[PDB]
Design a protein around this ligand. Sequence first.
Ligand SMILES: *[C@@H]1O[C@H](CO)[C@@H](O[C@@H]2O[C@H](CO)[C@@H](O[C@H]3O[C@H](CO)[C@@H](O)[C@H](O)[C@@H]3O)[C@H](O)[C@H]2NC(C)=O)[C@H](O)[C@H]1NC(C)=O
Ligand SMILES: *[C@@H]1O[C@H](CO)[C@@H](O[C@@H]2O[C@H](CO)[C@@H](O)[C@H](O)[C@H]2NC(C)=O)[C@H](O)[C@H]1NC(C)=O
Ligand SMILES: [Lu+3]
Length: 549
Amino acid sequence: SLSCDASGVCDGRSRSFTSIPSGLTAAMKSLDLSFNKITYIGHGDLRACANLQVLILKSSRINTIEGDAFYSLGSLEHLDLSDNHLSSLSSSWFGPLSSLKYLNLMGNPYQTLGVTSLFPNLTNLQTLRIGNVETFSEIRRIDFAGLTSLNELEIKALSLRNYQSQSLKSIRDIHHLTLHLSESAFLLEIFADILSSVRYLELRDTNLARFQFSPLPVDEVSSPMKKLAFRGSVLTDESFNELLKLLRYILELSEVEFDDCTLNGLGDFNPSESDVVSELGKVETVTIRRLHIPQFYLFYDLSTVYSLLEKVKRITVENSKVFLVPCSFSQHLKSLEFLDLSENLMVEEYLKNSACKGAWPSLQTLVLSQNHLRSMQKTGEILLTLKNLTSLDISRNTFHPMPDSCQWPEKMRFLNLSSTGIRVVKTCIPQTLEVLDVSNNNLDSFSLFLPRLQELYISRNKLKTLPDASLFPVLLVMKIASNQLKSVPDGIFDRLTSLQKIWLHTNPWDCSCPRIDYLSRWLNKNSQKEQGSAKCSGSGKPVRSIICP
Ligand SMILES: *[C@@H]1O[C@H](CO)[C@@H](O[C@@H]2O[C@H](CO)[C@@H](O[C@H]3O[C@H](CO)[C@@H](O)[C@H](O)[C@@H]3O)[C@H](O)[C@H]2NC(C)=O)[C@H](O)[C@H]1NC(C)=O
Ligand SMILES: *[C@@H]1O[C@H](CO)[C@@H](O[C@@H]2O[C@H](CO)[C@@H](O)[C@H](O)[C@H]2NC(C)=O)[C@H](O)[C@H]1NC(C)=O
Ligand SMILES: [Lu+3]
């Protein structure tokens, strides 16, 4: 039932094949036989595909593949056998695939990679994925013998029972390593074998409650690891302190991420010499999202965090119930340039403490995108302490109507007031602004003169009339999609003399011929500026299609 195209891209995906389709050719460059029922693959099912570059056999129900089944596929660069029923992996399968770049074997019920090295002859491999949720249980020294460089290696071993020493050490260059571990029993050991190879390490679903640090036998303590990421992990204050002791080896680590993690406040370490601040070495960026902190008893030290974040330049802590960032804590974040506190519980009174006198000196960008702020004037007043602030985002906050006069930090040139519920716009908004976003609100008109405005986002409001062009002399980008606009005054866009991009879609354009003449001609003379397609209200055809006598 195949359906191929001019360039050899054939599609047999999700048919109902019970065996590879008969009579394939050497013209096919890609064959997608996913979601089928190919239970067995024999000696002569892919013989005639000498030019095949892509073979996708994901989620079929393959449980048997003859040893020389891929023998004549020397031009194969992408092989995906994921989510099948392969209980065993044969080394003869990969013998004739020296040109293979991507190999996905994950999702198969095998217990190990076998007794024979499967990839020694895959000189050009770049991406390898192996493992599964409950069967894969052993990793051996012969498993990756031969591989020297890999862009991406993913190992799913949530049921791991044993890891041999140095199994990972033979590989010298791994740009991205993703390990799915359920327990930490072998983590320490695995670290010993990846510290001189892994650039980006990613741990998934790991319970690190009982993780303990212990000296490692590095060769020169020069780890090329730049990004460390924990996702869906469980930690304790005790095991957390053990984890940061590992930083002493990754002298170059610049980004640490914690996604959907849990921090059980139990244990509560006390040993002094077993704290090791080390100023988190060279951590430049810290990102925390959806951190769940069960039973946050009373007051913790917090001082065992000041000296730790002294050199961090970017911090993000979103959707983690943050309601207060103590002043003395902010005063120690001397290098913080970017702070993102989106989706938390901040309110004026506590922001006032978080943004005290010497708080976040040198902070350039602040994001308070979805908290419990109620007053624009009060917020602006509180942020006057941040002398270096140039970008402020306070979108998705329910504000009371803004006054006519406000005080904002001196260098503020970016202000995001999106999804803020405002119905009017007033001079509280400073003339210094370059970028302003008041999209997704309840505006009926815009009359603010912003001489330096370069970008206006006013999409998703109720403007019936377009803003006067003289209001933005050097405007580069204007977004005014989804806005009840029916027409524009003749010649208005030629007056936006520096305009580069404009969004006009989703507006009930009155395509009556006399009236729509200007708008139509301008769009035909400026298609490179329009993003999306302004359509006629009623019919639905593109406004640029109209041609009036
Ligand atoms: C002003 O603030 C706006 C609202 O906070 C912001 O819009 C939001 O932009 C983010 C990132 O571009 C979007 O992210 C979400 O959606 C993407 C795509 O589905 C997901 O991959 C993300 O995980 C996340 O869920 C928001 O959807 C978007 N909200 C909307 C629709 O307004 C503006 O970009 C800000 N304006 C400026 C000038 O920066
Ligand atoms: C962040 O803003 C502060 C403003 O206070 C800058 O630090 C001040 O710099 C002036 C130089 O004009 C000194 O006279 C002050 O003594 C400094 N304030 C103090 C006491 O810290 C700071 O340079 C800005 N950060 C950067 C590097 O952009
Ligand atoms: Lu509260």
